[PDB]
Design an enzyme around this catalytic site. Structure first.
Site, PDB file in Angstrom:
ATOM      1  N   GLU A 132       0.822  -1.211   0.000  1.00  0.00           N
ATOM      2  CA  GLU A 132       0.000   0.000   0.000  1.00  0.00           C
ATOM      3  C   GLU A 132       0.854   1.258   0.000  1.00  0.00           C
ATOM      4  O   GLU A 132       0.558   2.223  -0.721  1.00  0.00           O
ATOM      5  CB  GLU A 132      -0.930   0.048   1.203  1.00  0.00           C
ATOM      6  CG  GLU A 132      -2.140  -0.939   1.160  1.00  0.00           C
ATOM      7  CD  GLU A 132      -3.178  -0.651   0.053  1.00  0.00           C
ATOM      8  OE1 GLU A 132      -3.137   0.420  -0.601  1.00  0.00           O
ATOM      9  OE2 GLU A 132      -3.996  -1.550  -0.225  1.00  0.00           O
ATOM     10  N   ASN A 192      -7.783   9.440  -5.534  1.00  0.00           N
ATOM     11  CA  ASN A 192      -8.622   8.506  -6.282  1.00  0.00           C
ATOM     12  C   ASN A 192      -9.449   9.255  -7.326  1.00  0.00           C
ATOM     13  O   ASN A 192      -9.638  10.465  -7.244  1.00  0.00           O
ATOM     14  CB  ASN A 192      -9.554   7.753  -5.328  1.00  0.00           C
ATOM     15  CG  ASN A 192      -8.789   6.983  -4.253  1.00  0.00           C
ATOM     16  OD1 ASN A 192      -7.853   6.258  -4.544  1.00  0.00           O
ATOM     17  ND2 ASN A 192      -9.222   7.119  -3.015  1.00  0.00           N
ATOM     18  N   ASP A 231     -12.612   9.350  -7.829  1.00  0.00           N
ATOM     19  CA  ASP A 231     -13.811  10.020  -7.345  1.00  0.00           C
ATOM     20  C   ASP A 231     -13.511  11.299  -6.560  1.00  0.00           C
ATOM     21  O   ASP A 231     -14.458  11.968  -6.138  1.00  0.00           O
ATOM     22  CB  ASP A 231     -14.653   9.040  -6.517  1.00  0.00           C
ATOM     23  CG  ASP A 231     -14.009   8.660  -5.188  1.00  0.00           C
ATOM     24  OD1 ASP A 231     -12.864   9.054  -4.912  1.00  0.00           O
ATOM     25  OD2 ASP A 231     -14.674   7.971  -4.408  1.00  0.00           O
ATOM     26  N   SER A 287     -11.684  11.408  -3.652  1.00  0.00           N
ATOM     27  CA  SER A 287     -11.215  11.042  -2.320  1.00  0.00           C
ATOM     28  C   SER A 287      -9.705  10.817  -2.356  1.00  0.00           C
ATOM     29  O   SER A 287      -9.093  10.762  -3.417  1.00  0.00           O
ATOM     30  CB  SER A 287     -11.951   9.792  -1.831  1.00  0.00           C
ATOM     31  OG  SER A 287     -11.635   8.657  -2.619  1.00  0.00           O
ATOM     32  N   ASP A 299      -6.361   8.624  -0.322  1.00  0.00           N
ATOM     33  CA  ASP A 299      -5.888   7.607   0.617  1.00  0.00           C
ATOM     34  C   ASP A 299      -4.661   8.115   1.386  1.00  0.00           C
ATOM     35  O   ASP A 299      -3.761   8.734   0.798  1.00  0.00           O
ATOM     36  CB  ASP A 299      -5.495   6.327  -0.115  1.00  0.00           C
ATOM     37  CG  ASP A 299      -6.622   5.716  -0.894  1.00  0.00           C
ATOM     38  OD1 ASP A 299      -7.799   5.938  -0.590  1.00  0.00           O
ATOM     39  OD2 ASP A 299      -6.302   4.934  -1.793  1.00  0.00           O
ATOM     40  N   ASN A 307      -8.989   5.553   3.267  1.00  0.00           N
ATOM     41  CA  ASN A 307      -9.667   6.414   2.285  1.00  0.00           C
ATOM     42  C   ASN A 307     -10.597   7.444   2.946  1.00  0.00           C
ATOM     43  O   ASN A 307     -11.367   7.117   3.861  1.00  0.00           O
ATOM     44  CB  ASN A 307     -10.488   5.505   1.367  1.00  0.00           C
ATOM     45  CG  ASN A 307     -11.067   6.217   0.162  1.00  0.00           C
ATOM     46  OD1 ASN A 307     -11.241   7.414   0.134  1.00  0.00           O
ATOM     47  ND2 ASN A 307     -11.483   5.424  -0.807  1.00  0.00           N
TER      48      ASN A 307
END
Ligand SMILES: [Cl-]
Ligand SMILES: [Cl-]
Ligand code: NA
Length: 129
Positions: A35, A46, A48, A50, A52, A59
């Site tokens: 990750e 991301n 959309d 958002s 992380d 998220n």
């Protein structure tokens, strides 16, 4: 902070993650490697809108507040910036809530695709715990 592999394992074990909800420690170390490459300051946007955050790439759509993900939730009740600290306490505590929510570690795409079904004990082999 960029953790060493056995250093992170000891911190996660010192934070209650070994066998938490049935996931042995090596699963958590494997997830953090793919990750974030063990870097507490990692961020990734991301599609959309958002973002992380942190060593387990939690998220902002559901788990933290960053002030820039409209219509999102803050289920861990924390600013997302707290997930970037060198102290992993906030990330671990929020991860415990994520993994308890019904989908287990399948919430982490990199765990599903790169750790699930492999010899994850190899990630803690040689560490003093
Ligand atoms: Cl393990
Ligand atoms: Cl499960
Ligand atoms: Na949010």
């Amino acid at each position: 902070k960029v953790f060493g592999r056995c250093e992170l394992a000891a911190a996660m074990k010192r934070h209650g993650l070994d066998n938490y909800r049935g996931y042995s420690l090596g699963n958590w170390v494997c997830a953090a490697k793919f990750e974030s490459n063990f870097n507490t300051q990692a961020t990734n946007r991301n599609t959309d809108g958002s973002t992380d955050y942190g060593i387990l790439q939690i998220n902002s759509r559901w788990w933290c507040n960053d002030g820039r993900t409209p219509g999102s939730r803050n289920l861990c009740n924390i600013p997302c910036s707290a997930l970037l600290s060198s102290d992993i306490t906030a990330s671990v505590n929020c991860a415990k809530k994520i993994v308890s929510d019904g989908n287990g570690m399948n919430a982490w795409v990199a765990w599903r695709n790169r750790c699930k079904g492999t010899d994850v004990q190899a990630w803690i082999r040689g560490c003093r715990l």
